[PDB]
Amino acid sequence: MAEPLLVVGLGNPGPTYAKTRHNLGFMVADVLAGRIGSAFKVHKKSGAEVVTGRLAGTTVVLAKPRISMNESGRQVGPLAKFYSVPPQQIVVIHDELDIDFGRIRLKLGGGEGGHNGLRSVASALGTKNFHRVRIGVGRPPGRKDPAAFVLENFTSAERAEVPTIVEQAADATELLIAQGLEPAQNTVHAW
């Protein structure tokens, strides 16, 4: 009788990746978890880390794949099936190359850019029609490849603004859930 929203933060396992650009999705997820007030516990029938509760005035299932990017879909798909969550009710948080650093954009569907985790999720759901909270990390230092770039840590110049950026993404996520796509992206977007 409740029919939720599934919020998924993308990132890789492990100390080793805790501070990479590719782990912004996790950071935002940890903040949302803090706002909900509980810790992540493993959802045994899916293997992902799940937090359940109220967020932005509604019922929310917060998750973090405990599997690696390439395979996030194998837990996110089942997890969505577990709660009968439609694609339109799924929100995925991720780092974005096609947008400058600190810029946050909200989108429904469309290409998944160079993000291998998004690729996985869409391939598991059978559709690209889910909401994305894109957190800008920017384009590459001239010849360094995308994938490797997102697997590196933030430069210290970046490291300082990251905590603020994450809170803002968390706010934009609550804004999306509370008000809806159009209203939220009109508040969050400027040239």
Curated annotation (Swiss-Prot):
The gene is pth. Its EC number is 3.1.1.29. Monomer. Hydrolyzes ribosome-free peptidyl-tRNAs (with 1 or more amino acids incorporated), which drop off the ribosome during protein synthesis, or as a result of ribosome stalling. Catalyzes the release of premature peptidyl moieties from peptidyl-tRNA molecules trapped in stalled 50S ribosomal subunits, and thus maintains levels of free tRNAs and 50S ribosomes. It holds the Pfam family Pept_tRNA_hydro. Belongs to the PTH family. One of its GO terms (biological process) is rescue of stalled ribosome. This is Peptidyl-tRNA hydrolase.
